[PDB]
Amino acid sequence: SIRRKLVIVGDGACGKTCLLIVNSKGQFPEVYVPTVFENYVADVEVDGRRVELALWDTAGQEDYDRLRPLSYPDSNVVLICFSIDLPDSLENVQEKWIAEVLHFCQGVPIILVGCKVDLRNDPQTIEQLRQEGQQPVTSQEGQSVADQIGATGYYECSAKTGYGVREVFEAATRASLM
Amino acid sequence: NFLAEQYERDRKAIINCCFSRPDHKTGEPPNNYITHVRIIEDSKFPSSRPPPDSKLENKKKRLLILSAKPNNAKLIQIHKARENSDGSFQIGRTWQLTELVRVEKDLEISEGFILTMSKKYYWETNSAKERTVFIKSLITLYIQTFEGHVPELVNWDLSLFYLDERSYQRAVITNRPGSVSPIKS
Ligand SMILES: Nc1nc2c(ncn2[C@@H]2O[C@H](COP(=O)(O)OP(=O)(O)NP(=O)(O)O)[C@@H](O)[C@H]2O)c(=O)[nH]1
Numbered sequence: 001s002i003r004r005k006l007v008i009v010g011d012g013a014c015g016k017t018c019l020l021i022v023n024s025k026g027q028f029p030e031v032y033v034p035t036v037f038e039n040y041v042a043d044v045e046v047d048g049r050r051v052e053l054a055l056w057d058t059a060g061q062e063d064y065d066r067l068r069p070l071s072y073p074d075s076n077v078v079l080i081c082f083s084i085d086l087p088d089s090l091e092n093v094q095e096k097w098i099a100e101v102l103h104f105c106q107g108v109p110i111i112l113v114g115c116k117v118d119l120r121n122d123p124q125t126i127e128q129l130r131q132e133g134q135q136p137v138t139s140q141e142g143q144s145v146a147d148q149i150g151a152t153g154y155y156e157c158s159a160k161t162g163y164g165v166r167e168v169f170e171a172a173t174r175a176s177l178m
Numbered sequence: 179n180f181l182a183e184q185y186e187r188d189r190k191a192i193i194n195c196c197f198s199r200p201d202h203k204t205g206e207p208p209n210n211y212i213t214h215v216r217i218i219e220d221s222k223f224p225s226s227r228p229p230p231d232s233k234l235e236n237k238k239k240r241l242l243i244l245s246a247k248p249n250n251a252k253l254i255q256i257h258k259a260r261e262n263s264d265g266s267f268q269i270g271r272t273w274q275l276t277e278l279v280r281v282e283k284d285l286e287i288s289e290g291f292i293l294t295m296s297k298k299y300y301w302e303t304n305s306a307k308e309r310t311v312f313i314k315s316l317i318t319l320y321i322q323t324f325e326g327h328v329p330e331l332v333n334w335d336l337s338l339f340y341l342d343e344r345s346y347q348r349a350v351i352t353n354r355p356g357s358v359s360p361i362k363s
Pocket residue numbers: 010011012013014015016017018019029030031032033034035036058059060061115116117118119157158159160161
């Protein structure tokens with residue numbers, strides 16, 4: 001097989017780790033446990049090619065920024081995430097994340113990932129965002145920023161239900177091969 | 179308060195597998211947990227601030243946990259642990275608080291600090307706030323355990339430990355005739 005490296009970044013608690021957990025095996029973690037930095041290796045199968053996909057999980061919390069630059073190195077693909085129940089997280093995608101990825105991963109395929117799609121139509125989520133004077137991120141908005149940042153793909157998923165999770169990694173694995 | 183939750187979670191876990199049930203090896207009762215802190219160790223630079231380019235593969239995620247012997251509450255120990263899957267912890271190296279001879283604050287990294295026992299150990303806390311809480315704990319502990327004495331303190335604002343130049347000078351273990359060996363040649 002071919003060894004490829006995937007790096008995943010994005011706002012703290014937007015769902016990066018759960019994305020990895022649910023994909024590589026299962027069991028959706030309910031309690032939030034901030035990541036400092038952690039590496040995983042999953043063997044993905046896409047288009048007949050078997051790949052040893054190294055997954056470099058990073059920290060979304062501001063208090064751990066320090067270490068991130070250490071995960072970026074020899075990446076074959078970068079996944080920038082945001083949470084669809086937090087419009088602000090999408091703002092940061094273009095107001096922070098692209099810039100950072102562009103600096104440490106010059107010339108590496110990007111995949112914008114909207115997480116927690118299961119919340120898009122959650123009436124409670126919706127009502128709460130009303131107080132903040134806003135609403136769940138929409139597919140249009142996602143695609144838009146995806147295009148603005150020059151992402152080579154935009155996908156949505158829900159680690160909670162598993163929806164779209166596999167597609168995210170097949171896309172990432174495929175992008176890692178180009 | 180994600181740190182607070184983390185601490186509580188870690189606490190509960192740590193006491194459940196290392197300070198709750200009597201030792202499986204021998205019926206010997208377990209130590210009493212006092213506190214802990216998560217740390218980041220660099221294998222290539224274990225005793226000094228590592229350079230900005232030290233690769234992530236060199237970093238090790240560990241914990242420092244403090245406990246007292248069941249019998250004597252003045253016999254505290256420092257344990258270096260590793261968290262394994264399933265959420266359990268595995269205790270490795272162990273030191274006696276008595277060995278703590280120096281505590282230094284790193285002036286560049288807000289999470290860095292160096293402890294001196296037999297050797298010199300550089301470690302970083304996960305966050306600036308965590309170093310401050312831990313070191314406050316460690317020094318207060320030592321002070322409570324050793325009749326008001328303190329290890330050599332470097333670069334810390336003494337008021338952090340409710341001390342001042344005067345009190346510190348009187349308490350430092352370096353302030354004893356045979357305590358500091360001379361250089362040579
Ligand atoms: N409803 C829903 N909740 C999710 C989903 N993915 C993660 N969460 C929840 O949101 C929180 C954050 O998950 P986490 O994977 O730790 O995100 P993270 O961005 O990797 N965290 P960090 O930046 O701190 O490393 C957890 O409470 C988790 O249960 C999802 O698809 N749907």
